Structure 1
Amino acid sequence: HHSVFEDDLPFLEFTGSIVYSYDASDCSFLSEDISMSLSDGDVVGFDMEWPPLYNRGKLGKVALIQLCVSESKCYLFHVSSMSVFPQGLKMLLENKAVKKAGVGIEGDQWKLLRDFDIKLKNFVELTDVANKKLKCTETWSLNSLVKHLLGKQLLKDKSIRCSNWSKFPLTEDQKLYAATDAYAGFIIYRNLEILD
């Protein structure tokens, strides 16, 4: 048996516009569209994905970068398919003017630096924002925050989450999964920030 708290909740599924980009210049220009829609201090949900196979002692190289900039739009930048890392995206990620929210984001910063020599700037660990605004001291996960704040759980098909993110093109399922994780980061920040 199990408590109500242990019940399976509805899955969180982003239903807004998912912009898929797999070319460097397209990506850079898209990053500028993002910059035109935001103002200093604004926060976007952040996440990234990498293939399952290990490479020379480390995790597969980052293949996808996701940015949810509003409740109705999320970008999927398939960098593994790009000839060069998009300059517009590098500057957006290194821009202190835009805040990037997520869980375990400090670890993303490290991997991003190792993989592309990019310095993620002005990121916020959602775990700390939650403990701060919810007035608690918990060890959160993106899933537990989605559950606590939204009453939903994250899609969990392991064959999708641990799929070959570097395989082009991404499947509709991969796109849904990746976009939704960044969307979660965006919504969680927004809902927490509004708290008095």
Structure 2
Amino acid sequence: HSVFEDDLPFLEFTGSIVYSYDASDCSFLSEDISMSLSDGDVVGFDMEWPPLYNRGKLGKVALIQLCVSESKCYLFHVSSMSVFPQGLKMLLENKAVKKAGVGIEGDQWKLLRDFDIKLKNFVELTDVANKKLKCTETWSLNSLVKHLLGKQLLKDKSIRCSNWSKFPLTEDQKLYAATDAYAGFIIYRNLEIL
């Protein structure tokens, strides 16, 4: 196999991972996020859900990740919250904050479906790359991490495709879920060249 085929080092977030599994708590964290951002700021977005199917569809969303800086990532374990955090809902529906990721359009659908939350102001990284990188490629979060950071995403399937609704999350789940948002945040920020 070629050099381009080589196994690159793993992308692993090493900053602050804030784990929240209580509604009230979550709403206040969301306000913290909002106090630390300004209109037009982009955060890394992503979500996880259990593997078992529910009445014909994928398991209901259980976790939401938001990387707001190169050193802080939020893990909102909504599946463990009695009611969906009102502060998070306003954050995800606030077009003042932009959400970046790969396959977000799909996340929007599932989000509206599982929680009736309307995700506002999101960018499909695939398009941001093709635009700023002056190309016309088919991307995945992983292929973007590789091409731009010289790294690949953690891939233990037993982790990534694990029961995200199971409380509490394990350090590995937290790391995985957290790094995806981070990659979303870093990849967007790095594509701002001209």
- When normalised by structure 1's length, the TM-score is 0.98
Where does residue 125 of structure 1 map in the other structure? 124
**Using the alignment, how far apart are the partners of 2:47 and 2:102 within structure 1?**
11
- Secondary structure of residue in 2 paired with 1:193: coil
Offset of residue 80 of structure 1 = 0.2
**Using the alignment, how far apart are the partners of 1:73 and 1:10 within structure 2?**
21
- Secondary structure of residue in 1 paired with 2:11: coil
Where in structure 1 are there 5+ consecutive unaligned residues?
Answer: none
**Using the alignment, how far apart are the partners of 2:160 and 2:65 within structure 1?**
14
**Using the alignment, how far apart are the partners of 2:39 and 2:45 within structure 1?**
17
* Per-residue CA distance 1:34-63 (angstroms, 9 max, x = gap): 000000000000000000000000000000
Contact map agreement 2:132 2:193 (CA 8 A) in 1: no
Offset of residue 193 of structure 1 = 1.3
Taking the TM superposition and a 5 Å limit, the aligned residue runs for 1:1-196 are 2-195=1-194
* Per-residue CA distance 1:5-47 (angstroms, 9 max, x = gap): 0000000000000000000000000000000000000000000
Offset of residue 194 of structure 1 = 3.3
**Using the alignment, how far apart are the partners of 1:52 and 1:194 within structure 2?**
38
- Secondary structure of residue in 2 paired with 1:90: helix
Where in structure 2 are there 5+ consecutive unaligned residues?
Answer: none
Aligned length: 194
- Secondary structure of residue in 1 paired with 2:30: helix
* Per-residue CA distance 1:142-173 (angstroms, 9 max, x = gap): 00000000000000000000000000000000
User: What fraction of aligned residue pairs are identical, expressed as a percent?
Assistant: 100
**Using the alignment, how far apart are the partners of 2:143 and 2:76 within structure 1?**
26
**Using the alignment, how far apart are the partners of 1:11 and 1:52 within structure 2?**
24
**Using the alignment, how far apart are the partners of 1:176 and 1:118 within structure 2?**
25
- Secondary structure of residue in 2 paired with 1:160: helix
Cα RMSD after superposing both structures: 0.4
**Using the alignment, how far apart are the partners of 1:169 and 1:193 within structure 2?**
37
